[PDB]
Amino acid sequence: GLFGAIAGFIEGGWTGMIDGWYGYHHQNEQGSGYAADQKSTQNAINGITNKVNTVIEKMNIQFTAVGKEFNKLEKRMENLNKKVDDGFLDIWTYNAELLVLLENERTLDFHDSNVKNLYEKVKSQLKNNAKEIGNGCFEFYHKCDNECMESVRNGTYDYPKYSEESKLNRE
Amino acid sequence: GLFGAIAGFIEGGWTGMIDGWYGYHHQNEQGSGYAADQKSTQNAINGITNKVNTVIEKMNIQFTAVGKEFNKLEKRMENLNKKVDDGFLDIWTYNAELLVLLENERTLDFHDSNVKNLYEKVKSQLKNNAKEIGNGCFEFYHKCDNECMESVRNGTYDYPKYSEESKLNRE
Amino acid sequence: GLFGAIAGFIEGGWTGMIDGWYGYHHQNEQGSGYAADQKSTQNAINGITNKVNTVIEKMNIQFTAVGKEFNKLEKRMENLNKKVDDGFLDIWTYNAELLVLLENERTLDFHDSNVKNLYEKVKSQLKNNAKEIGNGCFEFYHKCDNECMESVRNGTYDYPKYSEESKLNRE
Amino acid sequence: DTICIGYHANNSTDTVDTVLEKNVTVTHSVNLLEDSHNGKLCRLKGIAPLQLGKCNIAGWLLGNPECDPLLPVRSWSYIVETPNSENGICYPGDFIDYEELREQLSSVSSFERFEIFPKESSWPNHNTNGVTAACSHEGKSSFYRNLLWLTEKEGSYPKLKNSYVNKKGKEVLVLWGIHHPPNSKEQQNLYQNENAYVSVVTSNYNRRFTPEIAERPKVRDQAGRMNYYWTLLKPGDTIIFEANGNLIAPMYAFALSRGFGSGIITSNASMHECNTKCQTPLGAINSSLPYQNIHPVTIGECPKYVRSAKLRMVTGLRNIPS
Amino acid sequence: DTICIGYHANNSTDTVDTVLEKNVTVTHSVNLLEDSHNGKLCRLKGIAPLQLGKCNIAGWLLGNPECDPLLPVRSWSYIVETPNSENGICYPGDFIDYEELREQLSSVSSFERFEIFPKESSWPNHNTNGVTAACSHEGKSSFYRNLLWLTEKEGSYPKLKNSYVNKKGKEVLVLWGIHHPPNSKEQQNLYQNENAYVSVVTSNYNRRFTPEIAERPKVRDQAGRMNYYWTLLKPGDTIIFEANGNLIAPMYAFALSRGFGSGIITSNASMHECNTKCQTPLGAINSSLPYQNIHPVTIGECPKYVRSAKLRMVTGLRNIPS
Amino acid sequence: DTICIGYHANNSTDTVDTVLEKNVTVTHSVNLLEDSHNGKLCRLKGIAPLQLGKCNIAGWLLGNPECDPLLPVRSWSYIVETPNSENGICYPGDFIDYEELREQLSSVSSFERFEIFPKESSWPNHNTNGVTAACSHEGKSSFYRNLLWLTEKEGSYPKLKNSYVNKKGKEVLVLWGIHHPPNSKEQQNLYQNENAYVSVVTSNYNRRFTPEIAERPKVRDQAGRMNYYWTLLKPGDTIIFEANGNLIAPMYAFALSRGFGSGIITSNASMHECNTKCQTPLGAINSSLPYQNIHPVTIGECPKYVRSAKLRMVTGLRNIPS
Numbered sequence A, B, C: 001g002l003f004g005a006i007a008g009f010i011e012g013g014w015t016g017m018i019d020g021w022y023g024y025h026h027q028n029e030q031g032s033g034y035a036a037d038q039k040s041t042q043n044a045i046n047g048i049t050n051k052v053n054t055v056i057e058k059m060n061i062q063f064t065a066v067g068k069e070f071n072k073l074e075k076r077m078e079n080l081n082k083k084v085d086d087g088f089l090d091i092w093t094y095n096a097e098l099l100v101l102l103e104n105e106r107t108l109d110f111h112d113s114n115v116k117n118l119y120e121k122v123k124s125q126l127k128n129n130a131k132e133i134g135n136g137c138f139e140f141y142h143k144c145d146n147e148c149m150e151s152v153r154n155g156t157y158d159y160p161k162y163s164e165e166s167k168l169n170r171e
Numbered sequence D, E, F: 001d002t003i004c005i006g007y008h009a010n011n012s013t014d015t016v017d018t019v020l021e022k023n024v025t026v027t028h029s030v031n032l033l034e035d036s037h038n039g040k041l042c043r044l045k046g047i048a049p050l051q052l053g054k055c056n057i058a059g060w061l062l063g064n065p066e067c068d069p070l071l072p073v074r075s076w077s078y079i080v081e082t083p084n085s086e087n088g089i090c091y092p093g094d095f096i097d098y099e100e101l102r103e104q105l106s107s108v109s110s111f112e113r114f115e116i117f118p119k120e121s122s123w124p125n126h127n128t129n130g131v132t133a134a135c136s137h138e139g140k141s142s143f144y145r146n147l148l149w150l151t152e153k154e155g156s157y158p159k160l161k162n163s164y165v166n167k168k169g170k171e172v173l174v175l176w177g178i179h180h181p182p183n184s185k186e187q188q189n190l191y192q193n194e195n196a197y198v199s200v201v202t203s204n205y206n207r208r209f210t211p212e213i214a215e216r217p218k219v220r221d222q223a224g225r226m227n228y229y230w231t232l233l234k235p236g237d238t239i240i241f242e243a244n245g246n247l248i249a250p251m252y253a254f255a256l257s258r259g260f261g262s263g264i265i266t267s268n269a270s271m272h273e274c275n276t277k278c279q280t281p282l283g284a285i286n287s288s289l290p291y292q293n294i295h296p297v298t299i300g301e302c303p304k305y306v307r308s309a310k311l312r313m314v315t316g317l318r319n320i321p322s
């Protein structure tokens, strides 16, 4: 977790959340439930899908590549041919292995980025109308409902509506 | 936007700001204007200019490289020569294309870094003497002027000067 | 400093701190001292040690590689052999140089990550029971001791214990 | 009431490596390294390969009698020799520019085997019955099906001259041989002329062959030697044979068509009723994967061969069902 | 009052690709892939190329009469043949080690063409008038300008022996030829000695040539053949010719100087009054760019050739004028 | 009271480069580019190299008298020639397939030098005393130690025929020579037969040699020439020599053992009592480092050679003791 979110201040994942990589858990008078943020999740899928496609597109089809034969008196050309085959293979193995390692690091860091950015977006939206209560959770100073929860998840949360009530409650 | 600033909580760029990549917009009794942060901008130019130079320096001049000819009975050496020319070209095309792709990703992320770092620097400087009012903007709880604005842009902002006044104003 | 911590809002390193890359400085009634965070530091060592090992493991042993000789009438095969030797060497020099450059950038950014993540962990732990006083330092609104300092460094800091006292003190 | 933001986990056991860490368990991932093949020789893009069976290019083109006779006309996507190359050269000597001819065949898409110099008509006043125990067939002494051992007839080897004009509209591969007796008595018996020569000529081929007489060590019971030669006769061009001894005359030759993406491979594997875009000596690959560790020898449109044991790229996140 | 931090945007339409995205519009960017050339052959670092015109290396060095005669002394940065290699070998046969001689010429920076064996003095008691319709000039039968067809004079071909000592202080390229008549009557007529030979010797070259008589198919109306040979005579070394027939004698040879960074290219393009650091068969490149997709064939100090359509690196930020 | 989080600094002066910056001073770092060697030739994995001294492969295998004689049996990890290759071919001519023989020796791990054809018994009715000033030893005319100059005895050169059977259980490298006199009188004097030949045969080698008589320029005072030939006689196989002149007969030959990871290098450096896993022409490397800029020529298990001046990877952080 390069950005300290994944395997950081949010210690675990939610096995209960099966419909996307990132999203929300709500608990209110009416009950509790999970829901993926489709915008941030779908964009994350598009990016990763574009990155896999990029790796494959850049590795072009290998066409027919076969052994050559050399007589008792062509040991140098045989050796030269081997040096060329071995050399290319050394290079391609190395290129392939590092590219997956580098991109994997970049990938995990990318998911960590998406979690930090979504948390900050909701936190900055909710502002002082709720308190950060650890492990990426907010505890409301006011009553929240399905309408309230749906408005926050899709980035349409209102401060004036609950500003007075929270202030009375927060003391 | 890996750090959620560019095309994130700051939805757009300022076409009006022509004198640098990052900087400030002020609005006060005396008027409104844009100004680039030269320190963060110039450092960003130096870095990017060093990165372009690095890519070019590492790709060394190609010296004379020409076709060879082979007789009716040298088909193997002709094929071997082609395998070597084709092989090197496959490798160099791949190396060139990925390097620009990787560095471009790293570049955009780098600019995103510079915006987050400058915002946090001014926010932490201004502290509770102003409120964060969304889209990377602060609304002052006190009167600010050209002297005030110039002192904040270059990282010389005073808290005690406005601490009492803001506190009375912030309620 | 991609994350604005190292050579950023924390302007310098602590030469006095010899027992790890990151950790804590405390100043209280009983005195002052430095101590490395072993968890974040050891994990940082493991990562970097795994990254150096990765670079070396991927560069496989070179086996016997020697010159060939060609007669007055084998100038083409001599030239072809040179093109193959020169070509491979051009490629490997480039691969080696960029890999250290890319990983070095990723390395510095990684250390910057570890500092931001540890600061946020303690800040979010201490919460409003202390104030952020610049240059990555907190000034307590209450008395702190060796037990208090040891509890904060290893992530076992209590809010209720000092919540009333700080509140009276913070005004 | 409380509201929380968090991330997906599941039952995934998939592991990947990064630069900083390894054996990292992840929610979702994709394999890039193809390691599965079907262990069969298959048709390539609809076209079957040429299976030489108990024969090697040398045995096939000379027509070693021990090799089951192929059709007079065939097409192929690639050529398969077996590791058990049991029937090749049967009469000992050198196959001149053999490796170059194999390379030529690597770009050949079909052949017509045809009677370039008919056995009955082409060689008046010479015997054509010559056989040898070195080129055995069902225990009886025999000879190459595509060459003819010309020897003396009624104590005379008249100087011969024969030419063929290529009206096939394809390159014609002509093979022939030169026999080198171990001693001057055998030379006398077979060809009568102690100072014999052979000449072969086209528009772009010109070579004279003179026998070299010496007691050599026995190879397949022969102290004598036979050198084998070939050329590609361009469409419309003429080949001329002159000899007063020692010529192993062409009888059958091959009209060659050129194609793309072919080669010669050696394989233990069996032809099955299957079709592939990618063939290796071990078996066919059916994959959109970029890399493979099955075999470096490929026919068709294949993944790039690498030595890697695993190449797995992460798509999901660190899987922590805690 | 309010204070805001934000970032530059402008009217930029430039697009780049990243790993995660593509067609990303950016404020500022730099092109790394040079695709522009001037479509001309130019001088390289002040030195003009050698244009062979209607000739190929073979036609030029033998001196095919159909080829306009070059100056006796020239220098060049590279050699240009044209796709229309109309005049090469005019009398049919093989140019032995032709490809090796081209490779030798790739590192040659100048030549002096000089009279190695003067026509009048060098060959007493032989005719030097020999010409052929295969090497035509303005409709009249002619011959190579740098070789001499020695034939019988007054029914005799005396054994000849001539040597030249290299006092030029440069490698001297000597060429010569061996004529192979189609039949024993022509051999008799031209050289009288039915069993002729040719010998050529230096300190490090030794080869004997014997004619090979046979009716070959007509090529440019000749059943006969001419094989062409060459060697590099080291400074101070001696070349000796002995023959009693069939020698196509050297008349003119070339004192060669070696240089760096040269080669042979084939080009449709025309020489213009221009100067470049980088030449391709399509045209010259004037670029500090690291990569180019113009041509893989380069002379001088060029960008590395790649197959890419675009290589654009971002320097500014995501351009969002919203 | 105040509590602070911060990071390590120290007295480190180490600098590294990144993509964005350079000359960045860092707390801790590791060098990956090995540039240190000991300037000695050393044993490789316990086995000493073969030092040819004043000799080159050619001088050694022919046995040039000026070269100090090696033991009759040796083993090595690699072969060292010196830049001062002063003693090679002593009698002028061509060493046929010389480069191919060097490549063969690159995979040879030991030899036994043995008397293939004993001087006294093997060549009845021929003189074996032949020496030359071209192959001088301590001012006296001498000859190659491993070859024998057969000439006339009492005005006769009888046709000779000798064969050796390889019962060594190793490939046997046999060398021999063919002498080409400058004129017909010397041919007569040395071998009597004006039309001499030499034949050499095995199961897979067959070649006839005929002398080529001509006045050549003097090389080491000889107008004559000597061509040198070799073959690898398979275990159990027989080599047969026939000649009626001009044969420079084998006397000593080499039983060769094949090994892994050997080669031939040229080095100014001296053998010392040391042992290494990695040898270069400049000296031995003792390193677990992945890269080296010492030399591209390597024996053993070495770092990959690169042109880089520095390859330093950062492990600590930006060092700021401010």
Ligand SMILES: O=C(c1ccc(N=[S@](=O)(F)N2Cc3cccnc3C2)cc1Cl)N1CCO[C@@H](c2ccccc2)C1
Pocket (backbone or CB within 6 Å): A018, A019, A020, A021, A045, A048, A049, A050, A052, A053, A056, D008, D028, D029, D030, D288, D289, D315, D316
């Ligand atoms: O992680 C992945 C994934 C897995 C593989 C992949 N690679 S592909 O785009 F399919 N790429 C692989 C491949 C191989 C061969 C040819 N073409 C292709 C195209 C792309 C992605 Cl997002 N997925 C599939 C999409 O949905 C993701 C998901 C997210 C949350 C909850 C449950 C599933 C999980």
Ligand SMILES: O=C(c1ccc(N=[S@](=O)(F)N2Cc3cccnc3C2)cc1Cl)N1CCO[C@@H](c2ccccc2)C1
Pocket (backbone or CB within 6 Å): B018, B019, B020, B021, B045, B048, B049, B050, B052, B053, B056, E008, E028, E029, E030, E288, E289, E315, E316
């Ligand atoms: O984005 C760039 C830019 C564009 C190209 C570049 N590459 S170079 O350093 F010029 N590199 C390119 C090149 C090519 C060939 C030879 N040498 C070189 C040197 C470096 C940079 Cl910062 N710029 C130029 C500097 O100013 C930047 C800017 C910033 C804000 C507002 C207006 C302009 C915009």
Ligand SMILES: O=C(c1ccc(N=[S@](=O)(F)N2Cc3cccnc3C2)cc1Cl)N1CCO[C@@H](c2ccccc2)C1
Pocket (backbone or CB within 6 Å): C018, C019, C020, C021, C045, C048, C049, C050, C052, C053, C056, F008, F028, F029, F030, F288, F289, F315, F316
């Ligand atoms: O920065 C490093 C460092 C230095 C080199 C290194 N590379 S190795 O893992 F030793 N790698 C280098 C090498 C070379 C050859 C063969 N095997 C290897 C293994 C790994 C690390 Cl963490 N260190 C060593 C560990 O302790 C770090 C440290 C941290 C804080 C205060 C004082 C020291 C400083």
Ligand SMILES: *[C@@H]1O[C@H](CO)[C@@H](O[C@@H]2O[C@H](CO)[C@@H](O)[C@H](O)[C@H]2NC(C)=O)[C@H](O)[C@H]1NC(C)=O
Pocket (backbone or CB within 6 Å): D013, D015, D023
């Ligand atoms: C990678 O890590 C996993 C840890 O989950 C290893 O897998 C398991 O190992 C533990 C060892 O105590 C067993 O109890 C589990 O039954 C294993 N589970 C599964 C599903 O494999 C694995 O061995 C590690 N591999 C490597 C190469 O380090």
Ligand SMILES: *[C@@H]1O[C@H](CO)[C@@H](O[C@@H]2O[C@H](CO)[C@@H](O)[C@H](O)[C@H]2NC(C)=O)[C@H](O)[C@H]1NC(C)=O
Pocket (backbone or CB within 6 Å): E013, E015, E023
């Ligand atoms: C890349 O994206 C840009 C989007 O701005 C495309 O350019 C334009 O496409 C829209 C399509 O509705 C037109 O209305 C504009 O006139 C276009 N403007 C310019 C200046 O080009 C572009 O087609 C896209 N290209 C690719 C390859 O995807």
Ligand SMILES: *[C@@H]1O[C@H](CO)[C@@H](O[C@@H]2O[C@H](CO)[C@@H](O)[C@H](O)[C@H]2NC(C)=O)[C@H](O)[C@H]1NC(C)=O
Pocket (backbone or CB within 6 Å): F013, F015, F023
């Ligand atoms: C890299 O930077 C360092 C800066 O510390 C240079 O080293 C020193 O240069 C200053 C120049 O005023 C001297 O006063 C110091 O005595 C130097 N100290 C040491 C320990 O070297 C160094 O020259 C720079 N190198 C490059 C290549 O830019």
Ligand SMILES: *[C@@H]1O[C@H](CO)[C@@H](O)[C@H](O)[C@H]1NC(C)=O
Pocket (backbone or CB within 6 Å): D011, D012
């Ligand atoms: C994991 O979960 C899926 C849920 O659909 C289940 O079908 C599968 O069998 C489980 N186990 C493994 C090893 O995939």
Ligand SMILES: *[C@@H]1O[C@H](CO)[C@@H](O)[C@H](O)[C@H]1NC(C)=O
Pocket (backbone or CB within 6 Å): D275, D286, D287
């Ligand atoms: C090849 O693999 C694909 C997997 O997508 C499969 O659907 C197909 O049936 C397989 N066989 C052929 C001949 O394509």
Ligand SMILES: *[C@@H]1O[C@H](CO)[C@@H](O)[C@H](O)[C@H]1NC(C)=O
Pocket (backbone or CB within 6 Å): E011, E012
């Ligand atoms: C973009 O803006 C510049 C401003 O100087 C202008 O000159 C230019 O013509 C504009 N359009 C394009 C396509 O560059």
Ligand SMILES: *[C@@H]1O[C@H](CO)[C@@H](O)[C@H](O)[C@H]1NC(C)=O
Pocket (backbone or CB within 6 Å): E275, E286, E287
């Ligand atoms: C080459 O390009 C540069 C661009 O910087 C230009 O100034 C110069 O005039 C061009 N021509 C030559 C011959 O350098």
Ligand SMILES: *[C@@H]1O[C@H](CO)[C@@H](O)[C@H](O)[C@H]1NC(C)=O
Pocket (backbone or CB within 6 Å): F011, F012
């Ligand atoms: C740096 O510090 C160490 C402390 O142990 C010291 O021994 C060393 O000599 C110092 N100087 C240098 C250049 O390493």
Ligand SMILES: *[C@@H]1O[C@H](CO)[C@@H](O)[C@H](O)[C@H]1NC(C)=O
Pocket (backbone or CB within 6 Å): F275, F286, F287
């Ligand atoms: C080689 O280098 C190592 C450094 O780890 C050293 O300990 C060893 O003594 C050196 N010599 C040999 C022969 O290994």
